[PDB]
Design a protein around this ligand. Structure first.
Ligand code: HEM
Ligand code: HEM
Ligand code: XH8
Ligand code: XH8
Ligand code: H4B
Ligand code: H4B
Ligand code: ZN
Lengths: 403, 404
C-alpha cells in the first residue's frame, strides 16, 4: 500500500502516500522491474483529467469548492461537451507548468520549482512567430549569465491537425558532422539533426562547436530554418584553475540548457512545443557531454595532457581526468559569471527538497538512477536515500520525433 | 515486436530482449503504479512445486530433461517429501544450485566468474565447534595466500521443528566498532551491534580501529559460541599510496577476503540458513564505501586535509579528488601485496561480457542497475549506459532476519 522509504546514512524513515495520487502506469510489474529503461516501450478521459487539474488549481490558490471553482468546472465541462476539447486560462497554465516541473522524477533541480517564468505563446500561428518567441525566451533566461528558469508554451495539440514542434532537442546544440572516414567532427549526439538542417538548406560549418540553426514547424507545414543571432547565445570557454595547458584544448560549452523536444501535458491538454530552460549542473557538461564515449569523448586526450598511464585501468586515469574536466567546467562558469551548480550542492538541495515535499504532499516522485550524479555517486547524500518513482500529472513526457 | 522487455545499450545503440524473466516465479516490490527498484530491503504443496522446478532445472543443465532418471528423481523427491515433509539434495544438485544462486544474483557485478565456484559440502556438520573448523578451512582455501579463490560452504538445511544453523556475523572478517562515551565510534560503525553482541557473550574487546571480530556461531537450539580466528588465517593489506608518501602514515588497512555469512541460500524450496561464501573485492567497495561513507570510516575529510584541499567549499571537488586517491591506494596496495583485486573499470567491462554470454545462454540476465553501477565514476564505466531488467530467479541468495 504505502512504501516505506529509508535513508541509510541517517537511519530515517518516511512513508510515501503521494503515490496513491498516481493515475498513469509506469513500466514495472511485480514480475520484473524496468526502472532503468530510459524511454517508455474518450471525452470522459479528457473530462476527468480536466476536472482533476482544475481541482488541483483551485486547491493551490486555497479556493476549493468556491463559486469561481464550481463555475470554472462548468466552463470546462460545457466546452468539452460541445467541442471535444477545452482551453486553459493563463494563470492555470502558469500553475500547470510549475507542477509539471515539480512532478518530474528525473530532475535534481526541483528545489527551484516555484520560481519559473512562464511565457504564453499560445497565440502563435507561424514558424516565424515561434522564432520571435524563442529568441525572447533565450534573452530572458540568459540574463547576461544570471540565469533564470523559464518556459514558453506554444499552441496545444488539436484533433486532426499537425503539431507545433521544435525539431531540435535543445535550443542550443553543437553540430555533429559525419566524416567519410567513420569519425565525427563535433557532437555525435547531434548528427541526425545536423543532417536535417543541411537537407533543409543550412550551409554547414566545420568546427567542433558550431551552434546549429533551429528547425521550427507550424502545423502541417514543412519546417523552416532559423539561425540564432550569435549574440543571443552565451558561451563559456573552458580553462582549468591550475593546469594552464587546458585552455589550449579549445573546449567550450553554452550557458543555457533549454530543452525543446518534450511534451507538456496539463489537464489532459497536450503542448507538443513548450521549450524550457534552467541552468546546468556541472556534471552534465563535465562528465556526460565531454567524457561519454559516444559524445565528445575527451577522457584520453586530457589524460595524456596530464601524463597519466593509459595502458591500464588500475591507475584510475579515467577517474583522474574526469575530475579535472569537471573542475574546469565549474571554475570557468564561475569565472565567466554564469549560473551553474556542482553535483554536491545540487544533491544537497535535492534532499532539502525531499524534506519540503514530504511535508507538503506526503512524498516526492524521484528516479534514483537519474538523481544520482554520474561521478562520485556515493559521495553525495542522494545515493544513500531510497526513492519511490511514479507518474503525476501535470507532467513532461517524451514524444516521437516529427520526422 | 516481441512480447518481452526490450533492453537498450545507449553507448552502442544495440538492442536485446529479455525472455529469461518469463521463468521468474517470485514477485519483486514493483507495480504498474510505482517503481520501488531502489529500495535496499523491500506447506508441502508449495515445497514440491519448487522442488519439482529445481529438479527440472538440474536435469536441463545436464541435458537429460524428460529422461528416465529425471522422472525417477522427481518421483524420489515426491516420495521423500511425502514421508518426511522435506527432502534432501544430491551432491551434484547442491553444486549446481549454489552456482545457479550466484548466477541469479541481480546485485552482483562479479558474475562472469559464476561457473568457477568451489562448493564445500558441510551438511554433515553437527556442532558449533565443527562449524568453526569448516569456516577456517574455507578461509584458508579461499585466501590461498593472496591468490583468492571463490568458495561457498554449505551447512545443514532448515529442518521442521529444529533450530537453524546460523552464523551471527555478517562477514567472516569484520572490524570491531566501539561505541565511545563521547558519542562517537572507534573502528567500523557498521559493526556496533555485532561488537556489543560479542562482548555480551564473553569477548574481551580491544580498542583499535581495526580489531578483527570473533565469530559468533550457532548450532541448532544452542546458544551461540564464541570463536577467535587465528590471526595468520586472516590476510590483511596495509594501505599506502603510490606517490603520496604520507598516506601510509594514516595506518589504514583492509582485509583480503570478503566472505558474506548472513545470507540464506534457497534451492528447490530448501533453505540453507548458514552458507558463507566469498569471492574477491572490487576496489570501490573498500576505497569508496567502507572508507568514505559518512556512516562508515568517514576518512574523506582527513585525506583531503592531507592533500591540502579546500574543504570549505563543494565546488573545489575535494571530495571527488580525495575519493579517487583513496581508491587508487586500495588498488596499488593490493597489487603490491599480490592479493587479488579488481578495479571498477575491469569489473564492469567483464560484466558486459557476462551479459552477452547470458543473452546467448539463457535469453537474458537479471540485474540491479543501482547496485551494478559503481559508487564513483558511474558513467565512466560501460554498465551505466546499459539498460537492465531486474527479477527474482531461483535458486537464490536472500536476506534473512538476524538470529537475535
Ligand atoms: C534550474 C535549475 C535546474 C537544474 C540544476 C536541473 C538539473 C537537472 C538534471 C541534472 C537533469 C538530468 C538531465 C540529464 O541527465 O539529461 C534534469 C532533468 C530534468 N529536468 Fe531539470 N534542472 C533545472 C531546471 C529545470 C526546469 C526549469 C524544468 C522545467 C520547467 C526542468 C525539468 C526537467 C525534466 C522534465 C527532466 C527529465 C528530463 C528527461 O527525462 O529527459 N528542470 N534536471
Ligand atoms: C569473484 C569475485 C566477486 C566480485 C568482484 C563480486 C563483486 C560484488 C560486488 C561489488 C557486490 C556489491 C556488494 C555491496 O556493494 O555491498 C556484489 C554483490 C553480491 N555478490 Fe558478488 N562478487 C564476487 C563473487 C561472489 C560470489 C562467489 C558470490 C556467491 C557465491 C557472490 C554473490 C553475491 C551476492 C548474493 C551479492 C548481493 C549482496 C547483497 O545484496 O547484499 N558474489 N558482488
Ligand atoms: N540542467 C538541465 C535542466 C533540465 C534538463 C532537462 C532535460 C535534459 C536532457 N534530457 C535527457 C536527454 C537524454 C535523452 C535521449 C534520448 C531520449 N530521451 C532522453 C537536460 C536538462 N538539464
Ligand atoms: N566482493 C564481494 C562479493 C560478494 C559480496 C556479497 C555481499 C556483499 C555485501 N552485501 C551488502 C551488505 C550491505 C547491506 C547492509 C544492510 C542491508 N543490506 C545490505 C559484498 C560482496 N562483495
Ligand atoms: C541505462 C540508464 O538508465 C541510462 O544510461 C541513464 C542512467 N542515469 C542517467 N542519469 C542522468 N541524469 N542522465 C542520464 O542520461 C542517465 N542515463
Ligand atoms: C538507497 C540505495 O538503494 C542504496 O544506497 C544502495 C544503492 N546502490 C548500492 N550498490 C551497491 N553495490 N551496494 C550498496 O550498498 C548500494 N546501496
Ligand atoms: Zn521498478
Amino acid at each position: 500500500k504505502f512504501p516505506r522509504v529509508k535513508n541509510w546514512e541517517l537511519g530515517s524513515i518516511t512513508y510515501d502516500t503521494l503515490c496513491a495520487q498516481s493515475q498513469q502506469d509506469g513500466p514495472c510489474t511485480p514480475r520484473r522491474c524496468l526502472g532503468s529503461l530510459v524511454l517508455p516501450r474518450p471525452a470522459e478521459q479528457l473530462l476527468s483529467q480536466a476536472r482533476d487539474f482544475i481541482n488541483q488549481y483551485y486547491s493551490s490558490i486555497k479556493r476549493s469548492g468556491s463559486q469561481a471553482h464550481e463555475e470554472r468546472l462548468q466552463e470546462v465541462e460545457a466546452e468539452v461537451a460541445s467541442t471535444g476539447t477545452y482551453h486553459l486560462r493563463e494563470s492555470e497554465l502558469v500553475f500547470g507548468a510549475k507542477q509539471a516541473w515539480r512532478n518530474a522524477p528525473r530532475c535534481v533541480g526541483r528545489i527551484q520549482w516555484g520560481k519559473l517564468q512562464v511565457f504564453d505563446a499560445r497565440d502563435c500561428s507561424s514558424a516565424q512567430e515561434m522564432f520571435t518567441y524563442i529568441c525572447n525566451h533565450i534573452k530572458y533566461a540568459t540574463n547576461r549569465g544570471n540565469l533564470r528558469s523559464a518556459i514558453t508554451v506554444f499552441p496545444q495539440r488539436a484533433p486532426g491537425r499537425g503539431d507545433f514542434r521544435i525539431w531540435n532537442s535543445q535550443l542550443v546544440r553543437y553540430a555533429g558532422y559525419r566524416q567519410q572516414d567513420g569519425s565525427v567532427r563535433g557532437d555525435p549526439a547531434n548528427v541526425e539533426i545536423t543532417e536535417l538542417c543541411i537537407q533543409h538548406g543550412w550551409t554547414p560549418g566545420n568546427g567542433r562547436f558550431d551552434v546549429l540553426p533551429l528547425l521550427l514547424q507550424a502545423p502541417d507545414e514543412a519546417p523552416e530554418l532559423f539561425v540564432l543571432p550569435p549574440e543571443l547565445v552565451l558561451e563559456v570557454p573552458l580553462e582549468h584553475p591550475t593546469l594552464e595547458w587546458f585552455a589550449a584544448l579549445g573546449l567550450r560549452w553554452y550557458a543555457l540548457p533549454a530543452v525543446s523536444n518534450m511534451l507538456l501535458e496539463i489537464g489532459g491538454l497536450e503542448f507538443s512545443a513548450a521549450p524550457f530552460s534552467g541552468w546546468y549542473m556541472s556534471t552534465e557538461i563535465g562528465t556526460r557531454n565531454l567524457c561519454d564515449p559516444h559524445r565528445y569523448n575527451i577522457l584520453e586526450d586530457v589524460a595524456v595532457c596530464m601524463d597519466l598511464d593509459t595502458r591500464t585501468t588500475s591507475s584510475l586515469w579515467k577517474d583522474k581526468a574526469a575530475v579535472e574536466i569537471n573542475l574546469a567546467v565549474l571554475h570557468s562558469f564561475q569565472l565567466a559569471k554564469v549560473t551553474i551548480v556542482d553535483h554536491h550542492a545540487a544533491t544537497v538541495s535535492f534532499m532539502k527538497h525531499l524534506d519540503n515535499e514530504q511535508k507538503a504532499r506526503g512524498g516526492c516522485p524521484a528516479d534514483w538512477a537519474w538523481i544520482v550524479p554520474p561521478i562520485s555517486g556515493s559521495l553525495t547524500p542522494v545515493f544513500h536515500q531510497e526513492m519511490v518513482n511514479y507518474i503525476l500529472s501535470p507532467a513532461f513526457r517524451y514524444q516521437p520525433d516529427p520526422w
